[PDB]
Amino acid sequence: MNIFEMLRIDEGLRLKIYKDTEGYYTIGIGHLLTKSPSLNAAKSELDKAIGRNCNGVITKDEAEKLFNQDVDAAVRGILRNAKLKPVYDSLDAVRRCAAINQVFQMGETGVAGFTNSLRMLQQKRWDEAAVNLAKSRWYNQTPNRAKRVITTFRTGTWDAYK
Ligand SMILES: OCCOc1ccccc1
């Protein structure tokens, strides 16, 4: 297991434009296109992302290209965030994956605001952090995934991803 295999499980792979769990146009391995309800706006974002006229459809190679960019961008975002960087750097590699997973799904600005969870994670109070992480919209809206990510934060193992 690694961050790519983890997010591949959590996000799936679809080659045609679809709506994510929040109802937003997405493609590939959880590549959010736009929050616009206009399919044409999503198609424009897709074509811009891929660099050709896609007509709402991409290849597996293209999906994987966006995925690598998105994972990279998530990590670099964490590293430039003054609240997230020290916590991220305090973690072991497996728990870092859980952190990347959350940021990939929820975005950096929101996650940087989870002040109490962040503190518990930096303190390595794992069971407390796990309890705190579940007290969230995130957990309520995507509980199966959140349980996996939380187990990863709690244990520093890949037990939830087998
Ligand atoms: O909800 C707690 C998120 O924990 C993180 C820790 C480090 C970087 C990003 C997230």
Residue of 80, 81, 114, 125 to mutate, ligand 1, most atoms within 8 A of C-beta? 114
- The whole domain housing 90 covers 1-162
The amino acid at residue 129 is: A
Residue 58 Cα to ligand 1 midpoint, Å, equals 31
CATH number at residue 155: 1.10.530.40
| Spatial separation of the C-alpha atoms in residues 7 and 130, rounded to whole Å | 19
Binding site residues for substrate, as ranges?
32, 104, 117, 132
| Cβ(118) – ligand 1 distance below 6 Å | yes
- Answer whether 115's CB lies under 8 Å from 123's CB: no
Experimental method: X-ray
Count: domains in the chain: 1
Residues in the chain: 162
Residue of 90, 104, 111, 123 to mutate, ligand 1, most atoms within 8 A of C-beta? 111
With residue 45 as reference, give the H or E element that holds it: helix 39-50
Report in angstroms the alpha-carbon separations of 91 from 26, 88, 125, 158: 30, 5, 12, 15
**Reduced to 3 states, what is the DSSP secondary structure of residue 32?**
strand
**Reduced to 3 states, what is the DSSP secondary structure of residue 113?**
coil
What residues does 19 pair with on adjacent strands? 25
The amino acid at residue 148 is: R
Please report where in the chains the tokens 């992302």 appear, as a residue.
49
To one decimal place, what's the resolution in Å?
Answer: 1.4
CA neighbor of 67 nearest in space, from 30, 12, 98, 93: 30
Rg of the chain over Cα atoms, rounded to whole angstroms, equals 16
